[PDB]
Design a protein around this ligand. Structure first.
Ligand SMILES: [Mg+2]
Lengths: 197, 197, 197, 197
């Protein structure tokens, strides 16, 4: 049962679809484990009634900082890895996608535990760029996740199923998350413990 | 006998050319050895009566997976390497090109043998992006290869020859493949065996 | 107090705003320490009355050189790293940003000390590229810093504060710098000394 | 004496300027030493009466090959490194630039000596892409160097001088080359010999 037909069209139905511009980014982001790595995740959706093409996702952490020399930098900006090194930030965006940032040694979240998170003053800006297919007109969409909108120990509720030849997207579940057993340690300490043996 | 003239034009004739939109991607993909590496290959063609410019190729594996923590991800998407790291995904596309994905340790096909392949539930989406030369208008074309459309132990029939000052493309051979002696081991086991001595 | 609203708009006020085209690049660049690394920095601003989108920054060192084989290359051009490897050269440009080039072993400034700098015959060209949001029309802006416009031992005066729900930009401070305690050694010798113990 | 003014304009005069479209690529390419590395070089020029913006250069080697398994690939295409890894392929193109490909272990020219070169059946396609500044209209220009158009032991004659506040480009020298003392060994053997001691 193919997703993409030989003629370039998709066997996808967008069901239970709400203002279009509220189905671009999930209201919340989540942190939980995937294949042994702690990941920060958010969901992104296509434009309704118009497919987005040449799509790419980027993310910036905005967070005040002070250098060791004492320079205060208000709302310092730094790039959050969501696939730039591998080309995974170039999206094939038909049905909604969970974008995943692996919290590793290069992530600004490396040292942040479940207990520490709500004490942080931070904001993740997410930026989706691309082009309207039918128009060749460029577009950008943006949103953000402040500290309280990042849910530790949660995954996204899946939205995609296969029904009678159509891959069905239930947009009623676009924004929904559920709790799952998750460590409360920071990624750094989780790794250190795995490395012991 | 040059392919590209000093004036920027090409000495190429597009022969035996069929609906234009059926000569963008080969109907099938193939797996066989090239210079000691197992490769997954598909063929791509230019637009007829209009040269494509700023051309680039990308490929995504669509395949359901479950994380070790038990999260089911329907039709999980991951990028397949077709030249991003070297710039080889930026095409000079006049006569048809065989795009090659080397099956190495980072390839999602690394552990898949000839016997295992038909048991896999997967789909490779291929995406060609660029711009119509005469119009400066952007374009995208897409297709896909499901499991049964990937032929293990085959190469593409060449289409290009030199005839009286013209490089001749025989589009009668665009889609044709032929069988060739190929190992049935997975790339992983082929490598392990080469590494022994 | 969020910078970016869920609706994609920003809580930023551009205050005390002067010809728009004089608030694109700081008149001067500076060199000083950040978290133990010597950095060359310059400030960039958005377009007034029109937000710039898909923004990116690049920088070129223009400087005559002679190869060891004796070839003189007038105004040889080489790229200066301002984020290409990490994606940090892709800007989210609303309030003004300090662009930072870390002076490391790959920087053309690696061996240049405070005393040597004014003896150098060089020019840093800075190039901001992007697209006007409301128009989808592309744009480029350029400027440069000759030797005397690079200030060793200085930082930029911050411009951003939080006032009554708005992040306030004081463009009166866009161009201003202040002196700060800074080593006069070249980055190379600073590193060598840190490496001793 | 600055090249780029604070207002973004350049202090460059394009002198002794011929059909515009013949001053895009040098008729020939050259091979000679630069700072101990053997380099393949060609010259590129801006469009006359219209500055090119967002400019980038790429290069492809076209050369038939046979795999060790016996597959013949007519006019196989592979990317030639002219700055992709560092961003040096993104040009600031006002006065003509010498594009340099370092012949290292990853270059398809690594094993080719002065005596071997004329025996090779090959063609380097060069592709300049960008946008007309005044129009925001995209453009591409292409040319190529066959075997006999690659001159071993030559450099380009410089074109740029400083005269009364203007950097002067002498387009009479755009295409001219001169002979210089150069090793005749392949880059590979040159390196091996340097490595001995
Ligand atoms: Mg890149």
């Amino acid at each position: 049962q193919r997703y993409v037909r030989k003629d370039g069209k998709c066997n996808v139905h967008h069901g239970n679809v709400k203002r279009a511009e509220t189905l671009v980014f999930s209201t919340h982001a989540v942190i939980s484990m995937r294949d042994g790595k702690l990941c920060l995740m958010f969901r992104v959706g296509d434009l309704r009634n118009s497919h987005i093409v040449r799509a790419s996702i980027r993310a910036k952490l905005i967070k005040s900082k002070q250098t060791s020399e004492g320079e205060f930098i208000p709302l310092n900006q730094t790039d959050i890895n969501v696939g730039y090194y591998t080309g995974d930030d170039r999206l094939f965006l038909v049905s909604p996608l969970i974008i995943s940032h692996e919290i590793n040694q290069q992530s600004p979240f490396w040292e942040i535990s479940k207990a520490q998170l709500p004490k942080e003053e931070l904001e993740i800006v997410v930026i989706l760029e691309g082009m309207v297919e039918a128009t060749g007109m460029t577009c950008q969409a943006r949103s953000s996740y402040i500290t309280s909108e990042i849910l530790w120990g949660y995954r996204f509720t899946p939205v995609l199923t296969l029904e009678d030849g159509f891959y069905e997207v239930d947009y009623n579940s676009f924004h929904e998350t559920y709790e799952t057993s998750t460590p409360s340690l920071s990624a750094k300490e989780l790794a250190e413990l795995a490395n012991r043996a």
